[PDB]
Amino acid sequence: DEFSYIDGNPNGPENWGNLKPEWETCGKGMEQSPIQLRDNRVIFDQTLGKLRRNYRAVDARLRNSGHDVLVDFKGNAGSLSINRVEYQLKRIHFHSPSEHEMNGERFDLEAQLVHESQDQKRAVVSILFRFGRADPFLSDLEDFIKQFSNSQKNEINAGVVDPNQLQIDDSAYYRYMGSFTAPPCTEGISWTVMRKVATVSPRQVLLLKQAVNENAINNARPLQPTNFRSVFYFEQLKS
Ligand SMILES: O=C1O[C@H]([C@@H](O)CO)C(O)=C1O
Question: What is the tissue localization of expression for this protein?
């Protein structure tokens, strides 16, 4: 699991796919994430509907992987519905700066909600943030996040973590097929990236960045080629 976000280094993002056989798709796959999201190339699909979530507050652990901080839910944290297929919410990864761009703009943080169906299909819902008012979700975790920095520990019980504190506006999003954004960069992942940009405070991002290894202080994978794949867009009109 040594990989780095330092461009130019032997273990850096351009080389991920040559580091070990298990990571080859990082270099050779053609539906890699993240990508550029461009309004002028989207296919509109009114048929997708408002994003259908039913999430539940539940017991969680915070983990420092060394290259990101994530929330790891212990109980059943509820689920996301796409095409009446149901995907359970398992984890939330944090990346600063953002990995996705929207019309050429890179944001200050991205949160990625990883879900898994019983069929084991994967869907990720991404939220993009600009510096502003604190994020209510991270507020309730700040003192736990701090402990990665004021101590030796790399897991922490965060108790009950509520995903309905997340800044998700269900009325508009992008949708496309992609990959995990870190090794093993596996494909077949449905991505939903929320149009509405949330806010997070600088203090909150700093806490996150304090937590990780040095080679991961910025932990965004560079944008990958779109390669002609389709990008769908839904947006609910006032009518
Ligand atoms: O699609 C994803 O890739 C990231 C990974 O880069 C985390 O470090 C993750 O877990 C996702 O939600």
Answer: Expressed in tuber (at protein level).
**CA–CA distance, 11 with 17 (Å, rounded to integer):** 9
Domain that holds residue 201: 1-239
CA of 144 to the centre of ligand 1 (A): 21
Which CATH number does the domain housing residue 118 bear? 3.10.200.10
- Burial degree of 139 (CB within 10 A; 0-12, 13-18, 19+): middle
Token reading at 172 = 């508009």
Resolution in angstroms comes to 2.1
Quote the number of domains for the chain.
1
Which atom of ligand 1 is least distant from the CA of 124? 12
C-alpha to C-alpha distance for 167 and 198, rounded to whole angstroms: 6
The residue whose C-alpha atom lies closest to atom 8 belonging to ligand 1 is 182
Q: Which long-range contacts (CB under 8 A, 24 or more apart) does 200-204 make?
A: 200/108, 200/109, 200/129, 200/130, 200/131, 200/132, 200/134, 200/135, 200/138, 201/131, 201/132, 201/133, 201/134, 201/135, 202/131, 203/134, 203/142, 204/109, 204/134, 204/135, 204/138, 204/139, 204/142
* Cα–Cα distance, 110 to 11 (Å, whole number): 23
Ligand 1 geometric centre to CA of 181 (Å): 5
The residue length of the chain stands at: 239
Options 53, 63, 67, 91, the catalytic residue: 67
Helix residue spans in 43-113 (DSSP H): none
Question: Which is nearest to 163 in space by CA: 138, 133, 190?
Answer: 138
